[PDB]
Structure 1
């Protein structure tokens, strides 16, 4: 539970570094491994003959990526510790450092190395207005700024009731709650269970 983490930025310096690099790569920080795919993908979608709603939903999801990436870093690494009193924090195993280290090097350079070696199989689109070229970087930045505002408001001495949008997000839209009870119930009672025609 991230609510029982906190204050790990210095206690786990190497895990911290890998966590920050991975979060920046995931959010499409320029020239990290994630940028060499996502950045081209958002430009390809922006400039295609495409469903307009699907395009908008994809950009909002890109913004939301910055938010839950921030949420991990803020609650896991920043602030004061919220874990129990007996501190057994230790990341100094060579198998742990070396395994993460290789993936860290991959997360910095793999996209660049792969991008420049694969042969082109399409005509990449490179002409577009400035607001379609930088859309991914902007909405990602906006998602980070908003994520900070939301996270820092958790410190204020104000207690809030839950909204309906908050409960929807927390319980995953109720899809598991509704479907994983109803559908098993129907099938399982299907067999272990009146028509006069059959009675004859």
Structure 2
């Protein structure tokens, strides 16, 4: 009800936008999933600022379901690699890891927004409510642009992991016979297929009504299609292409470092307080 709604919407929008781009440059499997988590948190914070509780709560539970599954998949993948999170080493896991890759595919699609998975029921209704209410022009663009970005990096990760040709080391422990790890995963996997629809009939004693023109209701799917193609297609390469990330070196370093936030918060700040400790003790506790 107050000015804080104005601010939270802006800050949240950047958070979901920034990691959306950051996820398209990071190369650590463990980190890409982390920015993915953070990117969707901004989505809740923004819709939450609109004034809706069930929508935020509904998506929150949905996020926990499949996002936990993704990390479980990553742990199995990494442990079979030589403890390396980098995606540039991995590749071709769709056949070397049948079961784990299948466990990932469902989770990734849930993030993508394939209709009637866990994520779709939450992402859809949220985007629809955004287009129904009185939103900011800048906020609206970030909402839908991030969804394109959300699918972009996700299939970018598909290429570097499953469809991409193998790029590992000479000695590879590729194996998918860890049943003890797998049984726990199928608990989440079942829920990620029914968690969405189940909660729709329970969370909402008064379902939201929506009636929007076709050329916006279909925008959520269309961007997801563009994002999936754009993320996948651009990920490809050849011998005589242009390393666009290298060419715009300054921009890539900016977006690949999360806008220098780690530097700002870890190397641009700690120098000053710690020096002050010396000047005090140097000049008072053993000086004046």
- TM-score norm. by structure 1 comes to 0.89
- Output the CA distance in 1 between the equivalents of 2:97 and 2:182: 11
User: Structure 1 residue 61: deviation in Å?
Assistant: 0.7
Secondary structure class of the residue paired with 1:192: helix
Which of 28, 31, 34 is equivalent to 2:119? 34
In 2: Cα distance, 1:102 partner to 1:68 partner: 26
Structure 1 equivalent of residue 213 of structure 2:
129
Between the aligned partners of 1:156 and 1:20, the Cα distance in structure 2 is 30
Higher RCO structure (Cα 8 Å, ≥6 apart): 1
**Rg larger for:** 1
- Deviation larger for 65-74 or 184-193: 184-193
Match of 1:140 among 221, 224, 237: 224
Residues 37-77 of structure 1: CA deviation (Å, up to 9, x unaligned): 01000000111111111111111111001111011111011
Residue 266 (structure 2) aligned to one of 180, 183, 190: 180
Looking at structure 2, the residues matched to 18 and 98 of structure 1 have their Cα atoms a distance apart, in angstroms, of 11
Q: Distance in 1 between matches of 2:90 and 2:232?
A: 18
**Structure 1 residue 21: deviation in Å?**
0.9
Whether 1:68 aligns to 2:166 is no
Taking only aligned residues, the RMSD between alpha carbons, in angstroms, comes to: 1.6
Number of aligned residues:
191
The answer to whether the aligner puts 1:20 opposite 2:69 as a matched pair is: no
Q: Distance in 2 between matches of 1:80 and 1:172?
A: 29
- In 2, the alpha carbon distance for the partners of 1:149 and 1:180 equals 36
Q: Which runs of 5+ in 1 are unaligned?
A: 194-200
- Where does residue 283 of structure 2 map in the other structure? none
